Amino acid sequence: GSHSMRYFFTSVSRPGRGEPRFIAVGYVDDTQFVRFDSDAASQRMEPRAPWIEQEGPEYWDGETRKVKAHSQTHRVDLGTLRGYYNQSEAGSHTVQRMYGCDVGSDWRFLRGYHQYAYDGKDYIALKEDLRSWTAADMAAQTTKHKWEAAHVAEQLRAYLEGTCVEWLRRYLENGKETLQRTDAPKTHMTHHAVSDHEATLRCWALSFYPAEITLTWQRDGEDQTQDTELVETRPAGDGTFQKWAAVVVPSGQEQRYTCHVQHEGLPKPLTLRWEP
């Protein structure tokens, strides 16, 4: 299937408390492989996946230098943005950056991304053509003109369409055992009597990878959203994900309901029904 490599960066100012907090993390698909945290003892980029540990000292020294450079640019940005929006020194502010690339089944470039946010809102983003920018407001237009003058889009296009896809292919091969696997969900249903008039059915999907999945309920073969509850897909902590969906049903009508589960690991969607 398709795959992706994404890097996420967060910088948070600390009024009257020094240098900003800086955190960077890297992912291949839904799997984290590196991190940098300014509060950490190491002050180095560190491995978070078994398959990246094999990379030599040249790799780790280079990533550490680059990530520290990303940290320093964010440090300057926090100061610049405070000025652009004329914000006071008493408040804490956040900068976020994300970039990366997607490749298709043939491992060829599909698309590239680079987006930036300030205080939880879109600030500036590279368009899908990787040639132009979308600026959220007049302050961001100042940044857009600087970045057009420095040909930032052309630089990112070369990175996203070249370096990014070449390294993602490399990681996909080195972490093949981990990254090119699909774990189908283990499923079951639970039942709880709430009252002599209603009961709840809960449909579970466990130990699945990747994280994308769909859980839906039907009553007599008809999609039903009323009286349903769906929780956000959540990490188990061991590299897989979990999710459930529930419905409150009239007592004694349990068997009229069916839970449907779609996932990349399921050749066919699964259908579950409460069976005591």
Binding site: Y7, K66, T73, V76, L81, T143, Q155, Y159, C164
Partner: peptide
């Protein structure tokens, strides 16, 4: 790997 180009201050 991280980008070595295209990362500039706002």
């Amino acid at each position: 790997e991280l980008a070595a180009i295209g990362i500039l201050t706002v």
